[PDB]
Design a binder for this molecule. Structure first.
Ligand SMILES: *CCC(=O)N1CC2(CCN(c3nc(N4CCCC4)nc(-c4c(C)ccc5[nH]ncc45)c3C#N)C2)C1
Ligand SMILES: Nc1nc2c(ncn2[C@@H]2O[C@H](COP(=O)(O)OP(=O)(O)O)[C@@H](O)[C@H]2O)c(=O)[nH]1
Ligand SMILES: [Mg+2]
Length: 170
């Protein structure tokens, strides 16, 4: 059979949400993508032997509270919390993204993966320990990715699917 998964990618402007999503859906690096374009993108893959349809919402546009965005999170089954390793502000924001998702879901048990993107860049500002410790406090996996080289990209998305599978068994 097959399983469908609703994924939502969140994080600050410019962390690589679209680039990561496009690497998953199209298998190459797209370095310029309109920051106002928010959409869902479907991609059929195979994960641990089962056909899996990933509907991936790539959040974008205006950072503004809206009921429409609350509905995205309510519908969403798992969330990539993305920051850039060379952007301390985007890492600081992760807390707020998690808090907002937790608010909507009304739960502390929500499938999430912390993603540190732009791992290819030489000048990092957010240390791995800081991210590892934050993920530990949340009880979620941490995966370093590069949308540029594709390092860790499948691992990030597939790990999130595996976290959703576990949650669904409860
Ligand atoms: C450069 C453009 C870009 O890629 N952006 C990502 C957004 C659009 C969606 N964003 C967003 N931001 C926030 N913030 C709260 C703390 C700092 C920014 N919250 C939400 C959000 C969440 C995570 C959950 C529920 C929400 N309801 N309204 C907003 C909600 C989103 C979203 N989506 C930044 C700019
Ligand atoms: N070096 C590097 N650049 C990246 C990576 N991911 C995204 N970028 C670049 O970062 C900028 C923002 O990427 P984008 O996908 O638009 O981020 P979004 O605003 O979160 O969707 C663009 O100039 C991308 O080319 C990465 O893994 N490595
Ligand atoms: Mg984008």
């Amino acid at each position: 059979g097959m399983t469908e998964y609703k994924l939502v990618v969140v994080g600050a402007c410019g962390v690589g949400k679209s680039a990561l999503t496009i690497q998953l859906i199209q298998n190459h690096f797209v370095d310029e993508y309109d920051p106002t374009i928010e959409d869902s993108y479907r991609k059929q893959v195979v994960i641990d032997g089962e056909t899996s349809l990933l509907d991936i919402l790539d959040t974008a546009g205006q950072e503004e509270y809206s009921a429409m965005r609350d509905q995205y999170m309510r519908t969403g089954e798992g969330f990539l919390l993305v920051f850039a390793i060379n952007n301390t502000k985007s890492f600081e924001d992760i807390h707020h993204y998690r808090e907002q998702i937790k608010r909507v879901k009304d739960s502390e048990d929500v499938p999430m993966v912390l993603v540190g993107n732009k791992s290819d860049l030489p000048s990092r500002t957010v240390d791995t320990k800081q991210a590892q410790d934050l993920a530990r406090s949340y009880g979620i996996p941490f995966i370093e990715t590069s949308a540029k080289t594709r390092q860790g990209v499948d691992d990030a998305f597939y790990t999130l699917v595996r976290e959703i599978r576990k949650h669904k068994e409860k």
